[PDB]
Amino acid sequence: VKISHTADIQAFFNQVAGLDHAEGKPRFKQIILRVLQDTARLIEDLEITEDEFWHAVDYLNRLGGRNEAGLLAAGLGIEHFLDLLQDAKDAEAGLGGGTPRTIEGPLYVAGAPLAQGEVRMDDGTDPGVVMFLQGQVFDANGKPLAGATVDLWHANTQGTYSYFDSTQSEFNLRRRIITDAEGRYRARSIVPSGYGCDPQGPTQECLDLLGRHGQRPAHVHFFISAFGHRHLTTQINFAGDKYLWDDFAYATRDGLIGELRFVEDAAAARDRGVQGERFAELSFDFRLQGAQSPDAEARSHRPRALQEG
């Protein structure tokens, strides 16, 4: 039984959307008219039962109250899909950039501590592997851009991010590094762990029904931007991780894999500001695009922890 195609019902969705008056935005009205016609068709095409419909509405309350809506768009590949479409859109406008882009994720936090060229990122709490992170920011041509900001955040060895994990100290593993004259950034930190969604959370309960896992490879998030250049959201995925190419949020891309190198020496005392038995080294450069508007460097208006806007 299909009633959604009758004028009787199109007239009803019409008034729900608000086309019954002159207040509100003629934009949502068009979007809600659409969201309603489509929602109705699924229900009629897949014959969703009342029980299915109401468990969805309720799941939706729980997804909301654990605050995992961004985590689910990510797990359903919706976030990756947007970058694909952003890419196809750039192909048309002929904006063949430098470093590829990849999903942002739901765990960013504004205003992290700021530093010139060098910074240590960890609070010296963990039994991790020190990781030395370094590279340059490049221009459209292949040149050093002094003064670009590389905004980075990553999980700790337990695989969690500060701020959401209260056990962690303020902005742990979170910093804004300013590139120096040679356009480089240096970061002393720790190898982050891959992580999974909360096993008893809304996102995973959905993935379970999909028969899917909710794991991600060890990675490091970046927000890179420079006066007169196009803002870039990307990640460095660590080489060798079991999930490198099986990420539940499908963010891993070619050219986005970091090659990690291990240096072993019980006594790394002299030679590099280290001390012993082992540490990681990783170098990765970002190449930006010429901006063609202030819009270019500006981050989405996506809401984020602490941007208080």
Ligand X SMILES: CCCCCCCCCCCCCCCC(=O)OC[C@H](COP(=O)([O-])OCC[N+](C)(C)C)OC(=O)CCCCCCCCCCCCCCC
| Cβ-proximal residue to ligand X, closest one | 56
Number of residues lying near ligand X (CB under 6 A): 18
81 touches ligand X (CB under 6 A): no
212 touches ligand X (CB under 6 A): no
Strands 261-263 and 279-283: antiparallel
**Shortest distance, position 225 Cβ to ligand X, whole Å:** 22
Q: Which residues from 82-121 bind Fe ion, rule CB under 5 A?
A: 105
59 has binding-site annotation: no
> What would you report as the CA-atom Rg of the chain, rounded to the nearest whole angstrom?
23
Comparing CB distances to Fe ion, the nearer of 136 and 160 is 160
Comparing CB distances to its own copies, the nearer of 181 and 209 is 209
Asked if 251 contacts 235 with a C-beta cutoff of 8 angstroms, the reply is: yes
Find the DSSP H helices in the chain: 7-17, 26-42, 50-66, 69-75, 78-92, 202-210
**Shortest distance, position 2 Cβ to Fe ion, whole Å:** 30
CA distance 121 to 185: 12
List the single partner that 210 binds among ligand X, its own copies, Fe ion, none, CB under 5 to 8 Å by kind. its own copies
**Shortest distance, position 261 Cβ to Fe ion, whole Å:** 22
Task: Give how far Cα 18 sits from Cα of 10, 23, 232, 234, Å.
Answer: 13, 8, 38, 39
Beta partners for residue 120, in sequence order:
188
CA angle, 257 then 172 then 154, to 5°: 15
**Shortest distance, position 103 Cβ to its own copies, whole Å:** 11
**Shortest distance, position 31 Cβ to Fe ion, whole Å:** 28
List the single partner that 16 binds among its own copies, Fe ion, ligand X, none, CB under 5 to 8 Å by kind. its own copies
Asked if 272 contacts 224 with a C-beta cutoff of 8 angstroms, the reply is: no
31 touches ligand X (CB under 6 A): yes
List the single partner that 105 binds among its own copies, ligand X, Fe ion, none, CB under 5 to 8 Å by kind. Fe ion
42 touches ligand X (CB under 6 A): yes
Comparing CB distances to ligand X, the nearer of 69 and 115 is 69
CA angle, 79 then 67 then 29, to 5°: 65
Comparing CB distances to its own copies, the nearer of 39 and 134 is 39
Asked if 138 contacts 145 with a C-beta cutoff of 8 angstroms, the reply is: yes
CA distance 243 to 238: 10
Which tokens in the block code for residue 111?
A: 């205003």
List the single partner that 77 binds among Fe ion, ligand X, its own copies, none, CB under 5 to 8 Å by kind. its own copies
286, burial (CB in 10 Å: exposed 0-12, middle 13-18, buried 19+): buried
Residue 85's SS3 state is helix
**Shortest distance, position 44 Cβ to ligand X, whole Å:** 11
Which tokens in the block code for residue 134?
A: 């370094």
CA distance 97 to 56: 40
206 touches ligand X (CB under 6 A): yes
Positions that interact with ligand X (CB under 6 A) = 28, 31, 39, 42, 48, 51-53, 55-57, 59-60, 69, 72-73, 206, 209
Positions that interact with Fe ion (CB under 5 A) = 105
Annotated binding-site residue numbers for Fe(3+): 161, 195, 219, 221
